[PDB]
Amino acid sequence: SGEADCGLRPLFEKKSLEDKTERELLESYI
Amino acid sequence: IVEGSDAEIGMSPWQVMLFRKSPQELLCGASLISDRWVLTAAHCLLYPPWDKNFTENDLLVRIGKHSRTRYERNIEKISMLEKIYIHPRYNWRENLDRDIALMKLKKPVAFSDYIHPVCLPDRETAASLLQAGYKGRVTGWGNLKETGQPSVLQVVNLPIVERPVCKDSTRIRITDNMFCAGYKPDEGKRGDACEGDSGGPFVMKSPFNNRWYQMGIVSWGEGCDRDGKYGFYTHVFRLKKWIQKVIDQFG
Amino acid sequence: DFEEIPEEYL
Ligand SMILES: N[C@H](Cc1ccccc1)C(=O)N1CCC[C@H]1C(=O)NCc1ccc(O)cc1
Numbered sequence: 001s002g003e004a005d006c007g008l009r010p011l012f013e014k015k016s017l018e019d020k021t022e023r024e025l026l027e028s029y030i
Numbered sequence: 031i032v033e034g035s036d037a038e039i040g041m042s043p044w045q046v047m048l049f050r051k052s053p054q055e056l057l058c059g060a061s062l063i064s065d066r067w068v069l070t071a072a073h074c075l076l077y078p079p080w081d082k083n084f085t086e087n088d089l090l091v092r093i094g095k096h097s098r099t100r101y102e103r104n105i106e107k108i109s110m111l112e113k114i115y116i117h118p119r120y121n122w123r124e125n126l127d128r129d130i131a132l133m134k135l136k137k138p139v140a141f142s143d144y145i146h147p148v149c150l151p152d153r154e155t156a157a158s159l160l161q162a163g164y165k166g167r168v169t170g171w172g173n174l175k176e177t178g179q180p181s182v183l184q185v186v187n188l189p190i191v192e193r194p195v196c197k198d199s200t201r202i203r204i205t206d207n208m209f210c211a212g213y214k215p216d217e218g219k220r221g222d223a224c225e226g227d228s229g230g231p232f233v234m235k236s237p238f239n240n241r242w243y244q245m246g247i248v249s250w251g252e253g254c255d256r257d258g259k260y261g262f263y264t265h266v267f268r269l270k271k272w273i274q275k276v277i278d279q280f281g
Numbered sequence: 282d283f284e285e286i287p288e289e290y291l
Pocket residue numbers: 073077124125126202222223224225226227228248249250251252253254260261262
């Protein structure tokens with residue numbers, strides 16, 4: 001269905017790799 | 031997307047391209063929310079002022095894409111539509127209130143490294159993250175400038191804007207079913223959605239569970255990347271009851 | 282401007 005693993009990208013979260021700008025989002029979540 | 035950058039491979043695996051069959055052209059963005067459901071803006075399918083009223087057989091969805099114009103053999107997957115559902119109170123007459131539509135695919139799509147669904151936010155995730163200053167991410171193959179078109183999917187991160195500033199930026203009537211995002215003139219940085227990005231997702235990565243959620247749908251703006259203007263997005267959580275009703279009933 | 286897609290989908 002996709003429910004259990006929604007929002008977890010195969011090439012990023014699933015492998016514990018970060019994309020080049022996701023940190024900018026995190027830094028804004030104050 | 032104006033003033034964005036090229037997406038990384040697999041960066042937005044829920045990104046969907048709505049593609050017109052004849053003539054073959056980009057119609058809109060969209061997002062994958064399960065193996066058989068795609069979310070987009072209602073104005074991508076129905077906008078009578080521009081004589082737009084698409085039926086299921088007019089369109090295809092292309093999932094897993096990166097290049098705008100190439101047929102990405104062995105990577106992208108192309109699906110036909112079983113049925114379109116437009117919000118019954120979508121206000122195409124005035125201000126694009128409730129600018130949301132769902133598309134059910136004829137067959138489930140197989141997930142891959144390039145094809146994977148985004149989550150939709152619960153009340154608490156929405157309340158925590160839909161705050162002025164918090165940034166989300168918009169993606170699409172739309173125009174690079176207001177007045178050309180990209181080789182590959184574009185991405186821009188943009189801050190949510192305070193509701194009074196959104197309201198004061200426009201003469202169009204805003205509603206609780208919308209939010210706006212973008213930098214202010216004094217913030218220096220730039221970026222916006224534009225024509226062709228319609229229907230694509232505004233996503234945020236929850237810092238609580240490290241999952242991506244779709245908070246918004248690219249809906250409307252006045253020009254693209256203009257100083258003192260902001261992009262407007264359908265507020266996905268506010269339309270949860272309708273989304274769930276459609277999927278629970280049909281599926 | 283777009284590359285032709287396989288006929289199976291049209
Ligand atoms: N310019 C109009 C304003 C309008 C709003 C509401 C009612 C009637 C008119 C508009 O933005 N329109 C018309 C209908 C489709 C929509 C549009 O083009 N969406 C693309 C877009 C561009 C930039 C963004 O940031 C986000 C999305």
